[PDB]
Amino acid sequence: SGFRKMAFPSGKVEGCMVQVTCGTTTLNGLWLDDVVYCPRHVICTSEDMLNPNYEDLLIRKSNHNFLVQAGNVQLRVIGHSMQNCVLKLKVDTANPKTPKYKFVRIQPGQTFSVLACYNGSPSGVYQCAMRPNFTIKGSFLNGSCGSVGFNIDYDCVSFCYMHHMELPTGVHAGTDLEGNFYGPFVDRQTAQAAGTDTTITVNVLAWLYAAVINGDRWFLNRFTTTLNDFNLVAMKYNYEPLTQDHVDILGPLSAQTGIAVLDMCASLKELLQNGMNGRTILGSALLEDEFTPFDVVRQCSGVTF
Amino acid sequence: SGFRKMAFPSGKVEGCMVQVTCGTTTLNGLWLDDVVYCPRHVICTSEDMLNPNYEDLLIRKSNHNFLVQAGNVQLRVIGHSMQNCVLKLKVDTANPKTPKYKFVRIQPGQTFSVLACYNGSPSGVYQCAMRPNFTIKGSFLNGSCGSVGFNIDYDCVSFCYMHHMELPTGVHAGTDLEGNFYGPFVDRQTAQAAGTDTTITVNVLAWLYAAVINGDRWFLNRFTTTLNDFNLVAMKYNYEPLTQDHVDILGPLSAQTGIAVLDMCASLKELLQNGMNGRTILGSALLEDEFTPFDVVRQCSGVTF
Numbered sequence: 001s002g003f004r005k006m007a008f009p010s011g012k013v014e015g016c017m018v019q020v021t022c023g024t025t026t027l028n029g030l031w032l033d034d035v036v037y038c039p040r041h042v043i044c045t046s047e048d049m050l051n052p053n054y055e056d057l058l059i060r061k062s063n064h065n066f067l068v069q070a071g072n073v074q075l076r077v078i079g080h081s082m083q084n085c086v087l088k089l090k091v092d093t094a095n096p097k098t099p100k101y102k103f104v105r106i107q108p109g110q111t112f113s114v115l116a117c118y119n120g121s122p123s124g125v126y127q128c129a130m131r132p133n134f135t136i137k138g139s140f141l142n143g144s145c146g147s148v149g150f151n152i153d154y155d156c157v158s159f160c161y162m163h164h165m166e167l168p169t170g171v172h173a174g175t176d177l178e179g180n181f182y183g184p185f186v187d188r189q190t191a192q193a194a195g196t197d198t199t200i201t202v203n204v205l206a207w208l209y210a211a212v213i214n215g216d217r218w219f220l221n222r223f224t225t226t227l228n229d230f231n232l233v234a235m236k237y238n239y240e241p242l243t244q245d246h247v248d249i250l251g252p253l254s255a256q257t258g259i260a261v262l263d264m265c266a267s268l269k270e271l272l273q274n275g276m277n278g279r280t281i282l283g284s285a286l287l288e289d290e291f292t293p294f295d296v297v298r299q300c301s302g303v304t305f
Numbered sequence: 306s307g308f309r310k311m312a313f314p315s316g317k318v319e320g321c322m323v324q325v326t327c328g329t330t331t332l333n334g335l336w337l338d339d340v341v342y343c344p345r346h347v348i349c350t351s352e353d354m355l356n357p358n359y360e361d362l363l364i365r366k367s368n369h370n371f372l373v374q375a376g377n378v379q380l381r382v383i384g385h386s387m388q389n390c391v392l393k394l395k396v397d398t399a400n401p402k403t404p405k406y407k408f409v410r411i412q413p414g415q416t417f418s419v420l421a422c423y424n425g426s427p428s429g430v431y432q433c434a435m436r437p438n439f440t441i442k443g444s445f446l447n448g449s450c451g452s453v454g455f456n457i458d459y460d461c462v463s464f465c466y467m468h469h470m471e472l473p474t475g476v477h478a479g480t481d482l483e484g485n486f487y488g489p490f491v492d493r494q495t496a497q498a499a500g501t502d503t504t505i506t507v508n509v510l511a512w513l514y515a516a517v518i519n520g521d522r523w524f525l526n527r528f529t530t531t532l533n534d535f536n537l538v539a540m541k542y543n544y545e546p547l548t549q550d551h552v553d554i555l556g557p558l559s560a561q562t563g564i565a566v567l568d569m570c571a572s573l574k575e576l577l578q579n580g581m582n583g584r585t586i587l588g589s590a591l592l593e594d595e596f597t598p599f600d601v602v603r604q605c606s607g608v609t610f
């Protein structure tokens with residue numbers, strides 16, 4: 001029993017972590033086959049952060065300016081290409097520990113683990129979600145870029161995120177491993193406001209199923225609701241609308257607990273309108289919205305990798 | 306910026322994870338050098354759980370009954386010894402990936418990461434604390450025993466916990482890697498009540514420093530308090546007493562933020578007496594007590610491994 005902010009095991013990503021020094025600035029890179037990926041701001045300093053010209057920087061730069069290190073072994077860069085806001089550094093050697101991997105661009109709502117690193121060495125691992133406004137509530141310091149987020153399927157690591165920036169709001173912004181930023185953010189020290197975040201309704205419901213599975217059942221009421229009426233209330237509390245595709249993704253939790261999704265929606269409707277009155281659900285006094293229906297299943301059923 | 310339930314990277318523990326089949330029952334084991342450690346209830350079934358006689362079980366059992374597997378490679382047991390409630394299985398081969406390790410018995414209040422595994426394969430990693438009543442709020446299912454908790458220092462993995470049982474209360478109990486149970490628990494299906502848990506005061510204060518470092522500062526008031534008067538109030542709300550050793554462990558956070566510990570104690574005194582009034586601190590509507598002063602430092606300063 002129990003429910004925790006579970007992250008995927010990080011060993012397979014630990015083996016692919018390098019540090020990348022171009023000039024004085026140093027950051028992290030992902031070493032896959034004979035290419036190292038890393039943010040493209042490794043070729044500019046904080047002096048250039050204001051509004052960098054990345055194309056003049058790499059133009060006037062050779063493969064010797066790039067010093068990749070893997071513990072103690074240094075790597076020799078043979079070519080360097082710029083795919084959007086990421087930098088592909090083709091190196092002579094290929095990482096022996098390159099796992100079965102893939103590059104995916106996740107959607108708002110989906111979760112992923114993060115392996116925070118500095119100087120190409122990993123500090124810790126934690127779980128995050130891509131917010132509806134394409135930000136994440138991470139935990140990063142100076143020298144954390146290159147740190148990546150990922151999902152797993154047995155042995156296929158699905159890289160989905162590379163860390164680039166932190167908005168003055170405390171939130172964080174990044175790209176996929178193809179260099180395209182999530183949301184309307186671009187790597188330069190310019191004021192860019194993220195949209196108004198919203199609560200991930202489907203994830204709140206999956207979290208409520210997890211509570212039921214674990215014994216917390218005081219919030220279950222006797223009612224049902226239509227999908228529209230629920231959405232009418234949720235709309236007031238800045239909750240994302242619940243589509244039928246979300247209802248279908250909860251089918252398994254619904255089937256497993258014997259609680260129809262729309263009855264659970266009725267339980268949540270009351271929680272939003274009346275609050276929790278100082279009670280807790282799975283040890284939290286707030287409604288949690290960073291657990292997907294799959295995250296609950298893999299944790300309450302125990303899928304391994 | 307940011308603050309998350311950060312866990313240590315799990316790669317080095319992933320490499321030491323095996324599955325151990327004695328009869329039909331299968332669980333997990335820790336493969337270090339030429340010995341595999343695992344709970345001693347692998348030689349008894351649920352039928353025996355009521356009150357097992359572990360010494361008659363291993364007596365009438367040979368090294369062929371023990372089938373250790375490491376992915377696909379099976380291992381050959383040469384000897385088997387019973388150290389308290391753990392089982393030492395001496396095998397012919399030695400784990401090539403055995404990291405610099407050590408076995409420590411942590412104290413109540415200390416935290417550690419957990420790598421939850423099933424069938425010798427890792428599902429996920431999360432962070433826990435040894436409660437003042439020698440339980441932990443984990444996330445374990447059937448077939449999770451053998452799963453271990455640990456801390457790290459650069460490259461020295463400090464194994465501190467192996468998972469054995471779950472009390473009907475939902476909490477969990479285990480042993481150190483020397484087979485001695487934390488608290489008054491013994492591996493048998495017998496009603497055993499844990500003490501009344503308490504809040505880890507020192508950790509709540511460290512968490513409050515972390516909030517200040519991250520911008521949440523509304524709870525800071527203008528007062529100071531004596532150590533005794535604080536303890537008098539904290540005593541009422543089931544908070545552990547704050548010793549001078551705890552005050553000294555907060556010195557660094559105190560020095561870094563410029564807030565004296567006893568003034569922070571005054572801020573917490575108000576939070577307990579008046580509550581938070583629907584506000585949050587680092588995204589939580591409750592006071593969190595599973596972060597040590599070191600856990601904050603390593604995360605807000607960025608120590609790597």
Ligand SMILES: *[C@@H](CC(=O)OCC)[C@H](C[C@@H]1CCNC1=O)NC(=O)[C@@H](CC(=O)[C@@H](NC(=O)c1cc(C)on1)C(C)C)Cc1ccc(F)cc1
Nearest residue numbers: 039041140141142143144145164165166188189190192306
């Ligand atoms: C990562 C860069 C690194 O590893 O080397 C240190 C310079 C760093 C992450 C943030 C640092 C502080 N905590 C973080 O999470 N990124 C940067 O320093 C970039 C600049 C910023 O992030 C600033 N914010 C903005 O520019 C901004 C963007 C928007 C839309 O609104 N404001 C904060 C530091 C204030 C620059 C950079 C440097 C090197 C890289 F590889 C990527 C990006």
Ligand SMILES: *[C@@H](CC(=O)OCC)[C@H](C[C@@H]1CCNC1=O)NC(=O)[C@@H](CC(=O)[C@@H](NC(=O)c1cc(C)on1)C(C)C)Cc1ccc(F)cc1
Nearest residue numbers: 001344346445446447448449450469470471493494495497
């Ligand atoms: C781990 C055993 C395993 O991996 O194989 C499955 C039998 C398992 C962990 C719990 C299972 C359910 N969720 C868990 O976290 N441990 C057990 O099954 C042991 C029996 C129990 O834990 C029961 N609780 C008690 O016995 C108890 C103890 C006290 C002080 O109060 N109540 C729960 C299942 C109800 C038996 C066991 C089997 C194999 C092992 F290697 C260790 C322990």
